[model samples]
Target: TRDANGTWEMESNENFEGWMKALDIDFALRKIAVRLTLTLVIDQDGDNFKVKCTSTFWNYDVDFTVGVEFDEYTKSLDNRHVKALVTWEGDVLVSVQKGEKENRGWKKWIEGDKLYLELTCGDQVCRQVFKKK
Candidate 1:
């Protein structure tokens, strides 16, 4: 995968509630998370990569190196500290978070003018597609 440096806005959101509910707390948390805009900004320059969830409701960023494990904390999502790792398997970027949640991670890749994200938590998976803005 090449550099994903650009501003991308959501073209569609799929089964996010299904994903959230698998790691459910209350309806209020899930309800509020669903109402936010799914705009994302991704930056990659060499080994450093960064992605930010651009939303009025919740804003958070994840930064990591290509092949390093780090302590990551995101209060907006689950509010748990997890050991996060990002690695490249051929052309796709794979992320796996190690903690209490089972099978919690994400995979993102660039396909033409669109960016595809597959978010997984437990048995639920959310597929989100974003178009370059």
Candidate 2:
């Protein structure tokens, strides 16, 4: 099964600013977000999961359960509220965010020693790769 229970540090981000822009994020926040290297601390317990995303500029935490939908407030990000549902698609952890925007969500998967995170907003998709640290 897919196990994401460790700390992972971001290695690279692909078209991150485009995704941020699609979400209507301000230019100043996008500038800082693009330059920041994110670190994720993921703790999984059966169907429950808690993910902590940290960077030099900001930090955010999310707690959710598999197969269940929960209200998630984006604080340091777009500063909005969304109903998030996480499900397992094979070994990939897929999140679907229901909000005012279209195609807004993220997915995470593991490949070899790397963890891949894909953030979606509108028609833009940003891929972020992370290595175990």
Candidate 3:
């Protein structure tokens, strides 16, 4: 099984601005977010998971259970309400956020000692790779 209990530091980002724009993020916030080297702290206990996204400008925390759907309010990124659900697709953790946006979701997968996060909104997808720390 994939164990996602560690602190991961951002390694690289691709098309991040496009993804943020798709979410209608503010221009100033987008500029700040684009330059941030975010860190992700993930703690998983059995089927429950807690993820904290930390950066210099802002931070966001999320708690969820596998195979369960919950209401998630995206505070800083887009400031939208979403029905979020996470499921395991093979060894990858896939999340689907249903709300006003079209095709909005994210996926997390581990490859060797690196963690890969893919964010999607509208027609834009951003790939962010993180190294375990």
Stretches > 4 Å off in candidate 3: none
Give the clashing residue pairs of candidate 2, or none.
none
Q: Which rank order by lDDT, best down to worst? A: 3, 2, 1
Ranking by TM-score: 3, 2, 1
Candidate 2 lDDT by residue in tens digits, 77-98: 7889999999999899999999
Model 2 misplacement above 4 A = none
| Candidate 2 C-alpha error for residue 110, in Å | 1.2
> Clashes in candidate 2: how many?
0
Worst 10 contiguous positions by lDDT, candidate 1: 22-31
Model 3 clash pairs?
none
Q: What are the per-residue Cα lDDT tens digits for candidate 1 across 1-133?
A: 4557899989888999999887665678788878888789988888898888878767778889989999988677778899999998778889999998899999988887888999999999999999999
Clashing pairs in 1: none
For candidate 1, the per-residue lDDT at 34 reads 83
Best by TM-score: 3
RMSD per model, one decimal: 1.3, 1.1, 1.0
